[PDB]
Amino acid sequence: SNKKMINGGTVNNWICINFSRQVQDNLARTFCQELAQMCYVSGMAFNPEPVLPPVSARPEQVEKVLKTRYHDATSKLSQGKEIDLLIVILPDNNGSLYGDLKRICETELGIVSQCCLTKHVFKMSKQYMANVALKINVKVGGRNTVL
């Protein structure tokens, strides 16, 4: 047995921010679509469309991009609803960007986030997608089997 979902969580509203200069908008979009579809067939409720299209940003503007995109996406939502998930595409070698992302998400925005490295975006393997679905599920309050 590989791990599976016991209870799938719910991602009704999500957005993607991209920090990789090797990744054009359409690829981030296609990536997120494949990931969304994996989470769904694995047992989640998962909106096949994001609240807003992916945006591309420089690592240097992590604070500004995250806060602004959070604000703009949340504002688009029916009053009282919140963003369930941020998918972030990172350069493979991103230095302090991961840790800065996570501090902002955890302690300022209080948003669930899932980072994905450029190398996996390019490969978009089903095994990778399945693993990341599992991580997401736990993060949004689902439950997975144990080995």
Ligand X SMILES: O=c1ccn([C@@H]2O[C@H](COP(=O)(O)O)[C@@H](O)[C@H]2O)c(=O)[nH]1
Smallest distance from ligand X to CB 100, Å: 10
Residue 73 within binding range of ligand X, rule CB under 6 A? no
Handedness of CA 131, 132, 133, 138 (dihedral sign): positive
Can you tell me which of 58, 64, 76, 135 binds ligand X, judged by CB under 6 A? 135
- Nearest CB to ligand X, comparing residues 76 and 92: 92
- Nearest CB to ligand X, comparing residues 76 and 143: 143
Can you tell me which of 113, 118, 137, 144 binds ligand X, judged by CB under 6 A? 113
Residue 115 within binding range of ligand X, rule CB under 6 A? yes
Residue 85 within binding range of ligand X, rule CB under 6 A? no
- Nearest CB to ligand X, comparing residues 78 and 126: 126
3 state SS for the chain = CCCCEEECCEECCEEEEECCCCCCHHHHHHHHHHHHHHHHHCCCEECCCCCCCCEECCHHHHHHHHHHHHHHHHHCCCCCCCCCEEEEEECCCCCCHHHHHHHHHHHHHCCCEEEEEHHHHHHCCHHHHHHHHHHHHHHCCCEECCC
Instruction: Point out which span in 4-12, 32-40, 59-67, 110-118 binds ligand X (CB under 6 A).
Output: 110-118
Residue 94 within binding range of ligand X, rule CB under 6 A? yes
Can you tell me which of 57, 117, 133, 140 binds ligand X, judged by CB under 6 A? 117
